[PDB]
Write a protein that binds this ligand. Structure first.
Ligand SMILES: Nc1nc(=O)c2c(CCc3ccc(C(=O)N[C@@H](CCC(=O)O)C(=O)O)cc3)c[nH]c2[nH]1
Ligand SMILES: *[C@@H]1O[C@H](CO)[C@@H](O)[C@H](O)[C@H]1NC(C)=O
Ligand SMILES: [Cl-]
Ligand SMILES: [K+]
Length: 202
C-alpha cells in the first residue's frame, strides 16, 4: 500500500504525485496524476534536451516512428506514479532510486522494436559507456553504428537491455491489468494504477 501513488527519488521527479494540467504532448495522458512537472514534460520532447543531454540521433537521425517510443518511455520514466512496486535503491549520483523489472506489456515492447528496427545505434546499453567529453553522448571507442536489430536481435533484448533492465517483458496483453502499458489514452483513468495495485498485493 506504501507502494501505490509514489514518485521515485530521482533527478527531476517531484516528491509526491499530483495533477499537472499542462503536461506537454505525449505526456498529457498523465495529466490527472503525474510525477513530472509541465517543464520536465516539455523539455523531454526536445532533441538532446537539458534533462540529460541525451542525443537520440547519435547514429544519424532517428526515425520519428522510432523516436516517439523513446519519448513515450521518458514520459513513463519521468511521470508515472504507478511504478512503486519496482522501485529499488541504487545510490547513484543522479538518482537514489530507479525502477527495475517493471512488467512491460509484450506488445508495447514488440511495437517499440518493430518501429525502431530500421533506425541505428552504436550500443546495446544506453546507460553506461558513452563518450560525454563534448557534453553530449557520442559513440565511444569500439562502438560502430549499426541497425537497431544488430544490437537488439529481439524485442526482449531492446526493452530489457537498453535501460539496464528497467523493464522485463510481460506475457500479458495491454488491457489485461497485469502489465504496465507505456502507451495508453487514459480517458477512463490511468490503466496502470490497477496494475501497481495488483502487484503490490503480491
Ligand atoms: N526507462 C528509462 N530509464 C532511463 O534512465 C531514461 C533516461 C535517462 C538516460 C541517461 C543515459 C545516460 C546517462 C549518463 O550520463 N551515463 C553515464 C554514466 C552515468 C553515471 O554516472 O551513473 C555514461 O556512462 O554514459 C544519464 C541518463 C531517459 N529515458 C529513460 N527511460
Ligand atoms: C504467453 O501467452 C500466450 C497466449 O497469449 C501463450 O500461448 C504462451 O504460453 C505464453 N507464454 C508463457 C511462457 O507462458
Ligand atoms: Cl502508425
Ligand atoms: K503510469
Amino acid at each position: 500500500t506504501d507502494l501505490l501513488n509514489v514518485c521515485m527519488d530521482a533527478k527531476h521527479h517531484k516528491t509526491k504525485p499530483g495533477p499537472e494540467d499542462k503536461l506537454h504532448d505525449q505526456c498529457s495522458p498523465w495529466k490527472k496524476n503525474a510525477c513530472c512537472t509541465a517543464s520536465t514534460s516539455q523539455e523531454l520532447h526536445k532533441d538532446t534536451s537539458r534533462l540529460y543531454n541525451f542525443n537520440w540521433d547519435h547514429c544519424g537521425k532517428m526515425e520519428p516512428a522510432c523516436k516517439r517510443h523513446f519519448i513515450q518511455d521518458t514520459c513513463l520514466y519521468e511521470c508515472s506514479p504507478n511504478l512503486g512496486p519496482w522501485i529499488q535503491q541504487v545510490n547513484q549520483s543522479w538518482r537514489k532510486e530507479r525502477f527495475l523489472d517493471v512488467p512491460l506489456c509484450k506488445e508495447d515492447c514488440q511495437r517499440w522494436w518493430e518501429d525502431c528496427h530500421t533506425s541505428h545505434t552504436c550500443k546495446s546499453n544506453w546507460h553506461r559507456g558513452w563518450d560525454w567529453t563534448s557534453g553530449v553522448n557520442k559513440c565511444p571507442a569500439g562502438a560502430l553504428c549499426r541497425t537497431f536489430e544488430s544490437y537488439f536481435p529481439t524485442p526482449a533484448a531492446l526493452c530489457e537491455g537498453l535501460w539496464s533492465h528497467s523493464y522485463k517483458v510481460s506475457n500479458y496483453s495491454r488491457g489485461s491489468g497485469r502489465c504496465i502499458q507505456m502507451w495508453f489514452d487514459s480517458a477512463q483513468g490511468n490503466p496502470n494504477e490497477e496494475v501497481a495495485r495488483f502487484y503490490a498485493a503480491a
